[PDB]
Scaffold this active site. Structure first.
Site, PDB file in Angstrom:
ATOM      1  N   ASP A   1      31.877  45.769  31.791  1.00 37.73           N
ATOM      2  CA  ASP A   1      32.795  45.872  32.921  1.00 37.73           C
ATOM      3  C   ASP A   1      34.058  46.643  32.529  1.00 37.73           C
ATOM      4  O   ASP A   1      34.135  47.201  31.431  1.00 37.73           O
ATOM      5  CB  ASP A   1      33.116  44.486  33.507  1.00 37.73           C
ATOM      6  CG  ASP A   1      33.950  43.613  32.576  1.00 37.73           C
ATOM      7  OD1 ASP A   1      34.471  44.100  31.548  1.00 37.73           O
ATOM      8  OD2 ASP A   1      34.101  42.412  32.894  1.00 37.73           O
TER       9      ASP A   1
ATOM     10  N   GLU B   1      32.489  46.083  43.197  1.00 43.40           N
ATOM     11  CA  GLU B   1      31.795  45.756  41.951  1.00 43.40           C
ATOM     12  C   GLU B   1      30.628  46.680  41.623  1.00 43.40           C
ATOM     13  O   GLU B   1      30.244  46.802  40.458  1.00 43.40           O
ATOM     14  CB  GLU B   1      31.324  44.297  41.963  1.00 43.40           C
ATOM     15  CG  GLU B   1      32.455  43.273  42.022  1.00 43.40           C
ATOM     16  CD  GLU B   1      33.288  43.213  40.745  1.00 43.40           C
ATOM     17  OE1 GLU B   1      32.909  43.843  39.730  1.00 43.40           O
ATOM     18  OE2 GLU B   1      34.328  42.523  40.755  1.00 43.40           O
TER      19      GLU B   1
ATOM     20  N   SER C   1      53.213  35.673  44.374  1.00 45.14           N
ATOM     21  CA  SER C   1      52.482  36.385  45.429  1.00 45.14           C
ATOM     22  C   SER C   1      51.867  35.400  46.417  1.00 45.14           C
ATOM     23  O   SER C   1      51.902  35.622  47.624  1.00 45.14           O
ATOM     24  CB  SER C   1      51.362  37.242  44.842  1.00 45.14           C
ATOM     25  OG  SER C   1      51.853  38.183  43.904  1.00 45.14           O
TER      26      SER C   1
ATOM     27  N   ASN D   1      54.717  42.478  45.645  1.00 40.56           N
ATOM     28  CA  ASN D   1      54.648  41.564  44.511  1.00 40.56           C
ATOM     29  C   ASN D   1      53.288  41.586  43.813  1.00 40.56           C
ATOM     30  O   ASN D   1      53.218  41.510  42.585  1.00 40.56           O
ATOM     31  CB  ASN D   1      54.998  40.146  44.939  1.00 40.56           C
ATOM     32  CG  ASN D   1      55.169  39.223  43.764  1.00 40.56           C
ATOM     33  OD1 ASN D   1      54.268  38.453  43.433  1.00 40.56           O
ATOM     34  ND2 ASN D   1      56.314  39.315  43.101  1.00 40.56           N
TER      35      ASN D   1
ATOM     36  N   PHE E   1      37.089  36.269  42.356  1.00 39.24           N
ATOM     37  CA  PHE E   1      35.848  36.831  41.820  1.00 39.24           C
ATOM     38  C   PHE E   1      36.139  37.703  40.596  1.00 39.24           C
ATOM     39  O   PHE E   1      35.460  37.600  39.571  1.00 39.24           O
ATOM     40  CB  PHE E   1      35.147  37.657  42.903  1.00 39.24           C
ATOM     41  CG  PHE E   1      33.734  38.068  42.560  1.00 39.24           C
ATOM     42  CD1 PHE E   1      33.487  39.174  41.753  1.00 39.24           C
ATOM     43  CD2 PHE E   1      32.651  37.365  43.084  1.00 39.24           C
ATOM     44  CE1 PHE E   1      32.178  39.561  41.446  1.00 39.24           C
ATOM     45  CE2 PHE E   1      31.342  37.748  42.795  1.00 39.24           C
ATOM     46  CZ  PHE E   1      31.105  38.844  41.975  1.00 39.24           C
TER      47      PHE E   1
ATOM     48  N   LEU F   1      29.743  38.655  35.421  1.00 41.73           N
ATOM     49  CA  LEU F   1      30.142  38.604  34.024  1.00 41.73           C
ATOM     50  C   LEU F   1      29.192  37.693  33.257  1.00 41.73           C
ATOM     51  O   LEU F   1      28.941  36.554  33.669  1.00 41.73           O
ATOM     52  CB  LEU F   1      31.582  38.094  33.905  1.00 41.73           C
ATOM     53  CG  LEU F   1      32.137  37.798  32.511  1.00 41.73           C
ATOM     54  CD1 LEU F   1      32.277  39.084  31.722  1.00 41.73           C
ATOM     55  CD2 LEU F   1      33.483  37.075  32.606  1.00 41.73           C
TER      56      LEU F   1
END
Ligand SMILES: [Cl-]
Length: 162
Positions: A20, A11, A117, A132, A104, A32
């Site tokens: 972002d 990040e 998945s 996947n 996150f 965010l």
């Protein structure tokens, strides 16, 4: 290596409001603020988050505080989710970190599309899960980060970050 160091790598850290990868106003370590195109709306959310009039700038400590809250909320969200919890609980600590990383970045709503998945992850079919996971908007939009998270799921090691 741990979830904090991992997300810190993925990040970054920026002390002023930035957009972002999706073009959304964000601050600190990928916190965010809003999906609103209004910078004023974002500044308001920031002030609300920090508890003072920030004028779009925060300190490292403030960034880390939000980060701690965000990681905490991410994991708690997983455990509160009836579908996600069993998959999370089935994982070892390294892959759990990879799970938190995805939550996150996307939110649980972003994770909803990863049902297939998740099943492979619970089955511990690591190479298949990895294949996947890459069949996703996520992978295509943020391939470098996705490759790191996927490698973590595939191997159960920190090799992609170490
Ligand atoms: Cl990179």
């Amino acid at each position: 290596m741990n979830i904090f160091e991992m997300l810190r790598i993925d990040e970054g850290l920026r002390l002023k409001i930035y957009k972002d990868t999706e073009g959304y106003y964000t601050i600190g370590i990928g916190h965010l603020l809003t999906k609103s195109p209004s910078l004023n709306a974002a500044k308001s959310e920031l002030d609300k988050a920090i508890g003072r009039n920030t004028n779009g700038v925060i300190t490292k400590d403030e960034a880390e505080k939000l980060f701690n809250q965000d990681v905490d909320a991410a994991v708690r969200g997983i455990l509160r989710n009836a579908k996600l919890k069993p998959v999370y609980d089935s994982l070892d600590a390294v892959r759990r970190a990879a799970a938190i990383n995805m939550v996150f970045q996307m939110g649980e709503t972003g994770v909803a599309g990863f049902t297939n998945s998740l099943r492979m992850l619970q089955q511990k079919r690591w190479d298949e899960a990895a294949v996947n996971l890459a069949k996703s908007r996520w992978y295509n939009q943020t391939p470098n980060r996705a490759k790191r998270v996927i490698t973590t799921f595939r191997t159960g090691t920190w090799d992609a970050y170490k």
